[PDB]
């Protein structure tokens, strides 16, 4: 029987600062035990200061990103070049996904940018459109390796104030872009060590009120 | 299907077919409604050029739409049957979906909407 889905591996990661947000993902693309490409980017600038990644089955991911990019274009045409806010983008993507509820896009989706007060924002979606705003989210093959690390190092979960008798929590606070990138780089190298589908290269898109910047780092190629 | 725009504007801004519909109403037997402090009464003329009428069975002029709302009319009797049936169907559908019978205003607004629709749909008068 024809199976209309496949699995292209990779893993992605979004983090939100006070006045920035990063969306990262590895550049390896796989099927089964073969490497298709060591550099196939899956994190895209969609305009209006929104970056997006749809990870899992790449055909579905590309189709979604294409449709959303197109949705931005028409939003301008129909609403007098109004800037599409990240919250509005998120809701639009829900309808894109849920519209194929009974033949889903096999992707975990993450978008990042700034909310309307200029604060860093990350939204993540399940394959059929359930979405949630978060400070922190990993998606894809190594989500399960990276996510609890982020709970610990980004939201300081399970960390208490020394000498307080486990009574006072380590206090929540925003991270600098420099710290956030260290956590991303360490997240992906750790994931690369222990997950066969993760490797080759790491491409990060950083988003501030000044636009979208990129950074790229090599990963282990085995 | 038959498509012709029968209800159209004339140069003076009148829709003649709608206005001629009013003429058919004006020829119709008289109907009156008066509302009291605590009741509403609907009265209706029946033209008296008809004896040998069987009044047991001849369609009465005040129709129940639901158990709490009535409708009477003046104009073409055959046309009125179409509106009454539609109204009755909507009344049951409203009870089914909203779990409440129609307000008089709602039922009125529905019947009005049906009437209006027939003034800008092709193929109908």
């Amino acid at each position: 029987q024809f199976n209309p889905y496949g699995d292209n591996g990779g893993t992605i990661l979004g983090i939100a600062g006070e006045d920035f947000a990063v969306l990262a993902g590895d550049t390896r693309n796989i099927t089964d035990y073969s490497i298709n490409s060591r550099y196939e980017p899956k994190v895209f600038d969609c305009g209006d200061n929104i970056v997006m990644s749809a990870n899992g089955f790449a055909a579905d991911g590309d189709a979604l990103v294409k449709r959303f990019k197109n949705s931005v274009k028409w939003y301008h045409f129909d609403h007098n070049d109004k800037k599409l806010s990240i919250n509005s983008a998120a809701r639009n993507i829900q309808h894109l996904l849920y519209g194929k509820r009974f033949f889903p896009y096999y992707v975990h989706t993450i978008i990042a940018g700034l909310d309307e007060d200029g604060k860093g924002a990350v939204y993540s979606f399940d394959p059929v459109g359930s979405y949630e705003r978060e400070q922190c989210r990993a998606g894809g093959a190594a989500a399960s390796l990276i996510m609890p690390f982020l709970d610990n190092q980004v939201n300081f979960k399970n960390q208490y104030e020394p000498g307080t008798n486990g009574k006072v929590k380590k206090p929540l606070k925003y991270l600098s872009v420099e710290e956030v990138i260290k956590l991303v780089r360490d997240s992906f190298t750790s994931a690369t060590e222990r997950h066969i589908q993760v490797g080759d290269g790491l491409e990060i898109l950083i988003v501030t009120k000044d636009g979208v910047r990129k950074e790229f780092y090599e990963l282990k190629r085995d | 299907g038959y498509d012709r725009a029968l209800s159209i504007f004339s140069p003076d801004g009148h829709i003649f077919q709608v206005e001629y519909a009013l003429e058919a109403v004006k020829r119709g037997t008289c109907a009156v409604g008066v509302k009291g402090k605590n009741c509403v009464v609907l009265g209706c003329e029946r033209r008296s050029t008809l004896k040998l009428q069987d009044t047991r069975i001849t369609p009465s002029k005040v129709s129940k739409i639901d158990s709490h709302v009535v409708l009477s009319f003046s104009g073409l009797n055959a046309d009125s049957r179409i509106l009454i049936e539609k109204a009755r169907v909507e009344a049951q559908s409203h009870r089914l979906t909203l779990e409440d019978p129609v307000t008089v205003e709602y039922l009125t607004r529905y019947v009005a909407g049906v009437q209006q629709r027939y003034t800008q749909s092709g193929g109908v008068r």
């Binding site: 399960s144 390796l145 609890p148 690390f149 709970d151 060590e193 222990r194 | -």
Partner: protein, 204 residues
Amino acid sequence: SDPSSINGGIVVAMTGKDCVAIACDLRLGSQSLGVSNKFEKIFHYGHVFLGITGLATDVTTLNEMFRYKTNLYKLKEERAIEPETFTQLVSSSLYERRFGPYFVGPVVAGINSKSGKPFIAGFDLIGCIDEAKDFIVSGTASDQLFGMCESLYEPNLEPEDLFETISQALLNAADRDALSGWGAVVYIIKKDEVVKRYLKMRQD
């Protein structure tokens, strides 16, 4: 109907400077229903520590079996079994049930009493020995533990530091797993003292 994830639970071991640490959660459930918050997964035979995740009946059975075998070992050999040797015994015993295995992910931790070396090892259900310098993980939250350990870990941690690292690896892995948590226990193990600490963690 996947025996290794009916009961839930996790075990992690870690080497530091002249010490090892081994830790586990306390949950025993029947799928969604948590049943006991007192189900420890770490046992010791002399100075050799064994943690076992997986199907709880097999966990109990293997503990009872390895107590049995290490007791006879001691009586005949007139000395306590060492970690390197116990590891081999664990492997032999699991592979002996090659076509009807115990559904477990055992982990061995200890310090060789002659050489003073810290030693850890893990096994698949069928006896394969996975030896490591750094850390071993096991259980329903093994992916999470792998991710925690691979980033948190650094070599040559001092006992009190290693405690923080291994505890934070376990706690955050457990909280991303439905079937693990409900309490934790951490063993810090040096040449000749062993400290056992019960961690405070979220109880959902």
